[PDB]
Design a protein around this ligand. Structure first.
Ligand SMILES: CCCCCCCC/C=C/CCCCCCCC(=O)OC[C@H](O)CO
Ligand SMILES: CCCCCCCC/C=C\CCCCCCCC(=O)OC[C@H](O)CO
Ligand SMILES: [Cl-]
Ligand SMILES: [Cl-]
Length: 299
């Protein structure tokens, strides 16, 4: 953490998408008190992503299995002592504190699957079972809320990890598509409510150049993630980085089809749409990915 050998390009990409999100929220249905909550979320997010830099990658992958278990027990616990919002209890609300176990599940499952899938030889049966028995508790506890947007993100991440690894992945796509079935000019206005109340306003006030630029920022972000992914000697790191990039790109392309018209899910546009927990969790995951990239040439 003392040396700062990071990929600063990815840092600039995250910062650029975040600054666009903030300058849009200030015109996309603004409110004096609704911009403060997300500003405090950004502060918390940067702070948490910095705190996680005092963590070696050895320790991070040592926590691969405990974090997975804790996300499983927290997914189970949110079903009992959660708060209903849109018909599903998926949030822990302790006054000003809002923590959804879906994010912890995503990171824990990515770490657990990456670590358990770096031994090249496996028995001819566990190529199906190991990702199955590690993903099914998470997806099942995500459907008991019910929240299938996070279930889709999780399952598609697992698909990406398995596919990049070199294991049976067709059954995962079958499960993914089956679960997914039960669901103003070139210039714009320039600043002149549903979940998409941050993106439906941006797409109209900034038009084709705005959407093209934002999708370009997301394309460059996914490109830099997959470039950092194949730039890691360890296989577990390759898997972890690629799973993260998959989940992120998948939320983005889910919001695309939502805007086209899908049904809608609770999945926000990462770093861009309104939501303090999603911002904080995306920043924390990006901090993890940044620290595993900085420790890529170490033991
Ligand atoms: C790393 C990136 C950090 C990003 C920066 C941290 C956030 C700070 C936000 C301050 C208020 C800005 C709110 C948005 C600005 C516009 C608000 C406004 O006055 O709306 C009027 C409208 O734009 C007239 O056309
Ligand atoms: C590990 C990362 C999980 C990130 C946890 C996602 C939820 C974090 C939100 C949080 O803890 O604080 C909420 C904030 O107070 C409201 O503005
Ligand atoms: Cl660069
Ligand atoms: Cl297959």
């Amino acid at each position: 953490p003392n040396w700062l050998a990071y990929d600063w390009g990815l840092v600039f990409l995250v910062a650029a998408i975040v600054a666009l999100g903030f300058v849009n929220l200030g015109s996309a249905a603004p409110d004096p008190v609704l911009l403060y909550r997300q500003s405090v979320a950004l502060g918390l997010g940067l702070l948490l992503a910095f705190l996680l830099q005092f963590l070696s990658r050895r320790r991070l992958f040592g926590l691969a299995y405990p974090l997975y278990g804790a996300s499983l027990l927290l997914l189970a616990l949110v079903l009992v002592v959660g708060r209903e919002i849109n018909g599903a209890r998926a949030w822990f609300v302790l006054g000003p504190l809002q923590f959804q176990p879906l994010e912890l599940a995503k990171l824990g499952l990515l770490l657990a699957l990456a670590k358990a899938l770096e031994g090249r030889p496996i028995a001819r049966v566990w190529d199906y079972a190991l990702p199955a028995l590690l993903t099914l508790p998470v997806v099942g506890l995500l459907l008991l809320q019910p929240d299938l947007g996070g279930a889709l993100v999780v399952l598609f991440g697992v698909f990406v990890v398995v596919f990049v690894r070199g294991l049976p992945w067709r059954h995962l796509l079958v499960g993914l598509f089956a679960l997914a079935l039960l669901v103003i000019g070139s210039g714009g206005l320039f600043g002149k409510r549903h979940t998409d109340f941050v993106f439906s306003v941006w797409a109209e006030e900034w038009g084709f150049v705005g959407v093209v630029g934002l999708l370009g920022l997301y394309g460059l972000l996914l490109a830099r993630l997959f470039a950092l992914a194949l730039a890691c000697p360890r296989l577990s790191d390759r898997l972890f980085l690629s799973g993260f990039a998959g989940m992120l790109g998948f939320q983005v392309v889910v919001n695309l089809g939502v805007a086209l018209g899908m049904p809608v899910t609770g999945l926000t546009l990462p770093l861009f749409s309104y939501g303090g927990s999603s911002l904080i969790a995306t920043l924390a995951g990006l901090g993890l990915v940044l620290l595993v990239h900085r420790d890529r040439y170490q033991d």
